[PDB]
Amino acid sequence: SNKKTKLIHGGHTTDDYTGAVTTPIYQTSTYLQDDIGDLRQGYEYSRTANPTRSSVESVIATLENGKHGFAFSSGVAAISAVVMLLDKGDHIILNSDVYGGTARALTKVFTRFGIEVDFVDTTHTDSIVQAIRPTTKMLFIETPSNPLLRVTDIKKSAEIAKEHGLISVVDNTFMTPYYQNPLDLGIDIVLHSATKYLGGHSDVVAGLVATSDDKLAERLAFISNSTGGILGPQDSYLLVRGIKTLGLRMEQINRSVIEIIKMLQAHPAVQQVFHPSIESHLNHDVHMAQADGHTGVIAFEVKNTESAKQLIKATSYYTLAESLGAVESLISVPALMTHASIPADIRAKEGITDGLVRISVGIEDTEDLVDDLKQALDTL
Amino acid sequence: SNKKTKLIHGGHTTDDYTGAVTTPIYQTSTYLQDDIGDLRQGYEYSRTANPTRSSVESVIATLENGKHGFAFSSGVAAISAVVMLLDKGDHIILNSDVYGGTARALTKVFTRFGIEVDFVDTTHTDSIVQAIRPTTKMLFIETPSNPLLRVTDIKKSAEIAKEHGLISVVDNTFMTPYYQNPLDLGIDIVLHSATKYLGGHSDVVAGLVATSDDKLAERLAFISNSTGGILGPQDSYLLVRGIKTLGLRMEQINRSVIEIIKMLQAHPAVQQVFHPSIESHLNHDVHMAQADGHTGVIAFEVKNTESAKQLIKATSYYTLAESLGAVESLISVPALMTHASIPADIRAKEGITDGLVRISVGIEDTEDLVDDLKQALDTL
Amino acid sequence: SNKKTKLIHGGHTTDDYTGAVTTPIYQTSTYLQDDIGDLRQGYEYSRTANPTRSSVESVIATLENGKHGFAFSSGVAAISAVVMLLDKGDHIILNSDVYGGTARALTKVFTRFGIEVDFVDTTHTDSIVQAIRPTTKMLFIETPSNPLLRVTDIKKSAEIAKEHGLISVVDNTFMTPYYQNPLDLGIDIVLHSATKYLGGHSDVVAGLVATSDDKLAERLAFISNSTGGILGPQDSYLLVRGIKTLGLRMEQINRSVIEIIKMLQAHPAVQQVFHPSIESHLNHDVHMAQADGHTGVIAFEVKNTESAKQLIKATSYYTLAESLGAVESLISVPALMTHASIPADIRAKEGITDGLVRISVGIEDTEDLVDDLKQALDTL
Amino acid sequence: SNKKTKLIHGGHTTDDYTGAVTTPIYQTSTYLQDDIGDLRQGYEYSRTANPTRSSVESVIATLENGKHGFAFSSGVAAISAVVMLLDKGDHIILNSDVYGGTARALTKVFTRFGIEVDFVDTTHTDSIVQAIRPTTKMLFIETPSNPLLRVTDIKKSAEIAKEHGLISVVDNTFMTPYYQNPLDLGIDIVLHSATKYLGGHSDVVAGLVATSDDKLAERLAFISNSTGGILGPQDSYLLVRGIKTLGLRMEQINRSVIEIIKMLQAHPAVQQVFHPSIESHLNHDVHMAQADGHTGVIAFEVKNTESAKQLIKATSYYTLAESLGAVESLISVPALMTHASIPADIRAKEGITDGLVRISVGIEDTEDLVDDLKQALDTL
Ligand SMILES: Cc1oc(Cn2ccc3ccc(Br)cc32)cc1C(=O)O
Ligand SMILES: Cc1oc(Cn2ccc3ccc(Br)cc32)cc1C(=O)O
Ligand SMILES: Cc1oc(Cn2ccc3ccc(Br)cc32)cc1C(=O)O
Ligand SMILES: Cc1oc(Cn2ccc3ccc(Br)cc32)cc1C(=O)O
Ligand SMILES: *Cc1c(COP(=O)(O)O)cnc(C)c1O
Numbered sequence A, B, C, D: 001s002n003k004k005t006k007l008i009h010g011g012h013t014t015d016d017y018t019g020a021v022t023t024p025i026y027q028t029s030t031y032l033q034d035d036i037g038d039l040r041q042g043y044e045y046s047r048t049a050n051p052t053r054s055s056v057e058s059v060i061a062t063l064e065n066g067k068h069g070f071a072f073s074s075g076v077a078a079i080s081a082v083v084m085l086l087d088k089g090d091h092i093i094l095n096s097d098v099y100g101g102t103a104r105a106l107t108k109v110f111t112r113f114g115i116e117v118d119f120v121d122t123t124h125t126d127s128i129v130q131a132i133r134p135t136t137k138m139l140f141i142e143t144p145s146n147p148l149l150r151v152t153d154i155k156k157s158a159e160i161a162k163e164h165g166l167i168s169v170v171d172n173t174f175m176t177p178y179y180q181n182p183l184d185l186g187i188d189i190v191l192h193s194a195t196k197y198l199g200g201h202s203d204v205v206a207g208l209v210a211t212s213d214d215k216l217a218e219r220l221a222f223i224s225n226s227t228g229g230i231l232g233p234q235d236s237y238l239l240v241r242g243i244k245t246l247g248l249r250m251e252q253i254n255r256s257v258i259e260i261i262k263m264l265q266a267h268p269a270v271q272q273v274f275h276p277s278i279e280s281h282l283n284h285d286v287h288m289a290q291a292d293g294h295t296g297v298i299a300f301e302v303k304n305t306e307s308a309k310q311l312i313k314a315t316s317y318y319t320l321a322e323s324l325g326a327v328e329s330l331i332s333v334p335a336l337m338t339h340a341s342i343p344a345d346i347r348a349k350e351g352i353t354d355g356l357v358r359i360s361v362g363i364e365d366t367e368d369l370v371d372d373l374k375q376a377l378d379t380l
C-alpha cells in the first residue's frame, strides 16, 4: 500500500524454506544439480545468479515499479554495464554537470571504445533535441545533479527519447525510489549508487539497476554475466537491511533539510544556496511535479576557501568525508575535493567557487544540525 | 622462505593497529579526513581502495612475485578490466580453447567495441607469430586449458610478446601461484578466477590480478576505479583466509590426481585421459619446465552420454555441480553443461565427445576417491 | 546533544586507525604482542575483549548514561551473567509476570545452585519491602512487562534497593534507552535483549548490559571472561548498525501505537486493551514520569481462540512469528505460544485469556497498520 | 569412509533448498509460522535453534561419532554449560593441571554455587578412584594437558565413571576429532574450544560439545536455551569452513612436530621437552593406544627468562600471541603469560620454570620451522 509499508514487505526478503524473516546470506559459489541441467531452485553458479543478490534485485525492482533488478559491485559498475548496451560509433547524451565518476568513465574509458559523448544542459529539454545525432542511442540524466542540484524534466526527456529511438536512463541516486520513480514517467532504465541512501549506513559500495523492459533486461543480464561486476552476498544482505529504514531516514533528512535551508538563507555569511526546494531554483516546479520529496544534498556559498575550512573545523556534527547519504551528516568542499583538477577559472565560471560547501544531511536531531551549522557560520 | 611459509606470512594480513592476527573486515564506504585531503592511512573511498581489499591484493602480488595486486568482483571482471587496457581497432590473440566465459566476453561484448579477437592454437608458439597483425596489442593465454588441458609455453609466449610489443597475460587459475608463476617467466600480467582454488571453499566469486609493471598497474587501477568491478571486503577476507591453506589443499589434490590417473589409464571403460602429467600429453615437458606441480582438473572419455550420466549417478564422493577447485571433488560433462551450444559435429571434431567427463579433484581421502570412481566405472 | 544526535555520534564507532566511518569487524581470536605483556591497543584474546564488541559496549554505555557496557550472546546470557553476581543462599526478587525465559532460567537452572527466587507484584513497591528477606541480594524488574504491560516505579525500586543493600537491575528491553534510562533513576544495572528493538532488524540474537558501578563492572567482566557468553564481532557490528536508526524506528512505532490503540478501543470486537499509554492503565502516571515515550508492544482481547486465529489469518501486514521489536509488525497469541504450559484456569486467572492477542508494532505506514488490523477485526 | 572424506562430506553442510554447496548464513532471529505452532522446517527462534548453528552442530556430532552437537559462544561457555548439569552440593573431579580458564570458572564462579572441585593427578586413574566422594557426579579430563602435555587414560576413566555413576567429560581440544574420539572410548560428553584447531584460522571464538546420550543432550539443550551462550551464525559458518581443512592442517602440523622435536632433543640450549610422542613421556603408550596422531602443542625448557625472551625475538616464523591451533606457529612463555599469578616457587615445583617455552606448531614449511627455531636457539 503506502510507501513505508512497501519498504518492509515489498520484494522477496524472507526464506521460503525455513521461514526466516530475513534473507539468508548465500556465501556460496555453486549449487548441486540433481540431474544434469536440473536446478533445484534455478541456481547453478553465483556469478550468473545468487539468492541473496536475487533478493536485493527483487527489492529494487519493486521499489522502482519495474520488473527486473540488477545488483552490481558499485554505482559506476552499474553505469558501465548500462553503457555497454551501446556499440562503437554510438552517441550518448548526458547532463553537462554529470557525476565526476560517470564523466571519467565515459570520456576516459568508453571513448577509447568508440562511444561518443555529448554533455548537454538538459535543464532545457530542447537542448537534448538539438544535440541528437543520427548515431545517438542513449540519453542519460541525473536529477537533481551534483553539486549544484540542477533539475531535469524526466517525463519530457522520456518522451524525447521515445520519439527518437533512444534508450533513456535516469541516475536516481540523489532522490531514491522513496521520492522519485523514473520508470513511472516513461524512462527505460533507472539506476542508483546504492553506496549512498539505499544502503544508508556508509558500509556498502554497490550499484542497483531496474527496468520494465524485458529485452533490455535480457541484455543487461548478459552483460552482467559476461563482465562480472556483480554485488556479493554479504553486501546484498546489508543493502536489503539498510533499505528497510529508507523511508524513515529520508523523512528525517527532509525535515532537517527544510530547517537548514531556512537558516542558510537567513545567514549573513552565506550567499547563494542550491537546492530544488527553493522556489527561485530553476525547474523547481518540474521537480515538485516529478518527485514528492527532496534530496538531502545541499550546496551553499561562503566567502572563500579559508571560510569553508573554518566552517568545517567549527562544526561538531558535520563529518569531513567523501560520499553522501549516510546516517551521519557529511561536509565537503567540491573545489578542493571532487573538482580540483578543473582549472580555477573554469570552476568559477561553472559556479564551483572556492567557498562552495556541500553538505549531505544525515539523521541527527534537526535542531542540533541547524544550531551547529549556524554557530559555525557565526564564527566567520 | 619455502612456499608453505610464504602462504602464511606473505603479504600484509594482520592489523598494525590492534595487532589482530587476521585482516579486519572494513565493511565501510568512506573515511574521516582530519584536514581536507589529509588521509590518515591513505584511504578516502572504498571503491578506490579498501583496507581488506588491499590485504588480499598484497597477498596475490606476493604469491605471484609481482608488485601490484587488484581484486575484482569475479574472474571475468578481472579479465574485462585487463581487456579494457586496449582500444577500438586493437587485436588480441587468445588460445583457441579459452574458457567459455572469456570467449563470450570477447566475441559478444568487446567485439562490439571494436576489439578484434583471433583464436590461435598456442601449443605451437609459432602460431602466435603467424597470427600477429600490425594492430595486435595483447596476447592472452591459459595454461593448461579447459577441458582438454592443453599446455602453452609461457616463457616463449612472453618472449614473443616482448619482441612484438604486446601486453602478455596469463590466466593462471588452473595451476595457482603455488605451482606456476608467469610473472617470473616474463609475462606482464597474471590473473585468476579466485572463485576456484585460491578461495578454495566454493564460497566466494572473485578475480585477482598481479603485475610488476608500474605503468600497467596505474592503468588497471584507473580502470578499476572507473568501471568499479571491485571485490567487497567480506569476500576479500574469505579469500585471504582460504589462501592460507592453498599449499596443503593443492598437495593433497596432487596426490589424488596421480593415483586417479593411474586408475583411469588402467580401466577398460575409459578411453583417452587428458592431463599434463601424462608423459604422452602434448607439451608435457613444457609444463614440467614451467610448473612444479599439477592442476586438479582431469578429463577422460567414457563411451557415450548414457555412460557419463551413469558414472555420475554411481559415485558417492563426486558432486555434480559447476565450477572447480573446491574442497569437494566435482564432476561434470562439458558436452552437456558448458559446450552444449556448439553443434555436436563440431564438439566431436574438437574432442568434446558426448562421453567426455571432467572431474575437479578435491581434498577427500585419496584411496576413497580412487575406489569410488573405479567402482562407479565398474558399473559400466 | 539531543537523542537522535547521540544515537549517531555517541560511543566510539569509527576507526581511529584508518578513519573508517564504521566500526571494523575484527573477525579474529588473538593479537600480536610486541613484547611479552605489551599489548598494542589493549587487546590480547577476543573472549576477554574484541574491538568490535568494545564498540557496541561503548554504545550501550553511552546510550544508558553508564560507564561500562557488556555484550552477550543473547538477552538470557546477559541475564544469567547478572544473576551470577549472587551466591548460593542468596535471594532475588522479580516482578511476578517476568519474561518466560527469565523465569525458566531462575526457577529451573539457578535454583539448582541455591539461588532463591520470589515473584512479587512490584506494581506496588511496598510488596518489594514486604518480600525482602535477610538473604535477599538482588531486585530485578522489567517495566513494562510482557504481555500485559504492567508498570513498576523504577525510582522507588532503586531507593528500596539502596536502603536494603540490594543490587537493583532493570530489564529495559521494551522501552529501549531512547525512552527510559534506569541508571539515571538510581538503578545499579540495566540490561536489554538487543535481539529486539536495539538490533531492530530481526537478524541478531544478543544481550547488552550497562552500569556506572566500577565494582559491579569488574565483577561482570570477570563473569563474562570466565563463563564466556560473549557476543561475536559480526553480531556486534550489526547491533551498532541497527542502533543508528533506533530513534527513527521508535518514533514511527509510537505514532502507529497511538493510532492503533484508538482503533482498538473503539472496535466492538475488542474488549480490554493493555498498554501504558492508556490513562486508566495501572501506574500510567508512573510510566509517564519515568519514560518519555512508549513501547511498541500492545496486547488486547478478542472473544476466543477462534477469533484470534481468524484475526491473524485476515491481516496482510502483521506477521505471525516469535520475538518483538522488528521492522515488521509481529502478531502472536500468548496463551498458545508462550504461556501454553500454564494450565488454562491459571492463564484465565492471570488475564492470559484464549483471545489475548499480542502485537509488536513495526515501522510500516501507520494508516496501513490501523486499516489492516481494523478490517481484520471487522471480519469477526 | 576415511577421515579426510568424512571431513568434507560428513554432517549436513549444504542447502537442501537451493542446492548451495555451502551452508547458508542465517543472519536471522525469528521465523514465519504458517499456522500457530506449525514450523516450516522446525525453526522458531534463533536462540533455541538456527540453521547455520545446526549445521556446525551436525558436523561436530558426526566427527566425534556422537548423536547430538551443541555450539557455544566460546570454549569456556561450553564448559560452563556442561558444569551446569550439576547441582549445588555435587562434586567434580578434574585433572590437576586443567586449563587455566576452566580452573578459574570452577574455583571462582561455580564454587559460589555450591559445586565442589577436586584437582587430581589423573595420569594414574586410581587417583580418581581414591578421590571419589559420595557427592561426586562428574569426571572432567583433558588429555593431553597444558602446558606439560600430561596424558590421561580415557578408556579407564570412562570405565571408572560408569562404575561410580559419574558423568564423564573429555576436553578434546588439543587432539581434535581427527586424532582422538573420546565418545568411542565410552565417555559421555566430549567438548572443544573450537577457537583453536577446529576453526583453525584464529578468527572465531567458539565452543563445541558432542554426546550420544539422549538424556544428557536434552539437558544440555535446555541449559543452552535458558542461559543462552549460543554461537552466532557467522561464526558457525566460519567454523564449518575451517573444519573442512582440519585433516590437512593436522597432518602438516604433525610432520613439523616430529622434526621439531628431533631438533629440540638434540639441541644443547634445550633441556626437557614435553610431548606425548616422546617415548619416555609418561603414558606415551596410553596416548598411542587412544589416539592415532599428535597435538601441535610442544613445551620445552631453555635456561631462564632472558633466554626465552631472546629466543622469541630471534625467530622469524613464530608469532608471540595467546591461543593455539592457528595456521601460524605461535610461541609463548607460560610463567609470564598464563601462570604468572602463581608464586614462582610453586611454578618451579610444578615444572612451569622461567625458561619453559610453549609453541603451537602451525602449517608453515617444516624445514623453515625447524631451521628458524634452531638458529634462534643457536643465538643462546
Ligand atoms: C574528473 C571530472 O571530470 C569531469 C567532467 N568534466 C570535464 C571537463 C569539465 C569541466 C567542468 C565540469 Br563541472 C566537469 C568537467 C567531472 C569531474 C569531477 O570529478 O567532478
Ligand atoms: C559459449 C562458448 O563459446 C565459446 C567460444 N567458441 C565459439 C565457437 C567455438 C567452437 C569450439 C569451441 Br571449443 C569454442 C567456441 C566457448 C564457449 C564455452 O562455453 O565453452
Ligand atoms: C515457561 C514459563 O514459566 C513462567 C513462570 N511461571 C511459573 C508459573 C507461572 C504462572 C503464571 C505465570 Br504468568 C508465569 C509462571 C513463565 C513462562 C512463560 O514462558 O511465559
Ligand atoms: C589462574 C589459574 O588458576 C589455575 C588453577 N590453580 C590454582 C592454584 C594452582 C597452582 C598450580 C597450577 Br599449575 C594451577 C593452579 C590455573 C590457572 C592458569 O591460568 O593457568
Ligand atoms: C502497497 C504495496 C505494494 C504496491 O505498491 P505501489 O506503490 O502501489 O506500486 C507493493 N508491495 C507491497 C508489500 C505493498 O504493501
Ligand SMILES: *Cc1c(COP(=O)(O)O)cnc(C)c1O
Binding pocket: B001, B002, B005, B006, B008, B009, B010, B011, B065
Ligand atoms: C620466503 C618468504 C618470501 C620470499 O618468497 P620467494 O618465493 O623466495 O619469492 C616472502 N614472504 C615470506 C613471508 C617468506 O617467508
Ligand SMILES: *Cc1c(COP(=O)(O)O)cnc(C)c1O
Binding pocket: C001, C002, C005, C006, C008, C009, C010, C011, C065
Ligand atoms: C549530546 C550528546 C551526548 C550527551 O548526551 P546526554 O543525553 O546529554 O547524556 C553524548 N554524545 C553525543 C555524541 C552527543 O551529541
Ligand SMILES: *Cc1c(COP(=O)(O)O)cnc(C)c1O
Binding pocket: D001, D002, D005, D006, D008, D009, D010, D011, D065
Ligand atoms: C566414511 C564416512 C562416514 C563414516 O565415518 P566413520 O569414521 O566410519 O564413523 C561418515 N560420513 C561420511 C561422509 C563418510 O564418508
Ligand SMILES: C[As](C)(=O)[O-]
Binding pocket: A123, A124, A125, A126, A153, A156
Ligand atoms: C523550456 As521546456 C518546458 O521545452 O524544457
Ligand SMILES: C[As](C)(=O)[O-]
Binding pocket: A100, A101, A322, A323, A338, B045
Ligand atoms: C565524489 As565520489 C562518490 O567519486 O568519492
Ligand SMILES: C[As](C)(=O)[O-]
Binding pocket: B123, B124, B125, B126, B153, B156
Ligand atoms: C614447436 As616450438 C618449440 O617453436 O613452440
Ligand SMILES: C[As](C)(=O)[O-]
Binding pocket: A045, B100, B101, B322, B323, B338
Ligand atoms: C564453467 As563456469 C565457471 O562459466 O559456470
Ligand SMILES: C[As](C)(=O)[O-]
Binding pocket: C123, C124, C125, C126, C153, C156
Ligand atoms: C502505592 As506506592 C506510591 O508506595 O508504589
Ligand SMILES: C[As](C)(=O)[O-]
Binding pocket: C100, C101, C322, C323, C338, D045
Ligand atoms: C517469547 As521468546 C523471545 O522466549 O521466543
Ligand SMILES: C[As](C)(=O)[O-]
Binding pocket: D123, D124, D125, D126, D153, D156
Ligand atoms: C597405573 As593404572 C594402569 O591403574 O592408570
Ligand SMILES: C[As](C)(=O)[O-]
Binding pocket: C045, D100, D101, D322, D323, D338
Ligand atoms: C591461555 As587463553 C586461551 O585463557 O588466552
Ligand code: NA
Binding pocket: A122, A123, A124, A125, A152, A153, A283, A286
Ligand atoms: Na525543462
Ligand code: NA
Binding pocket: A183, A186, A187, A188, A212
Ligand atoms: Na516503459
Ligand code: NA
Binding pocket: B122, B123, B124, B125, B152, B153, B283, B286
Ligand atoms: Na610450444
Ligand code: NA
Binding pocket: B183, B186, B187, B188, B212
Ligand atoms: Na616483467
Ligand code: NA
Binding pocket: C122, C123, C124, C125, C152, C153, C283, C286
Ligand atoms: Na508503585
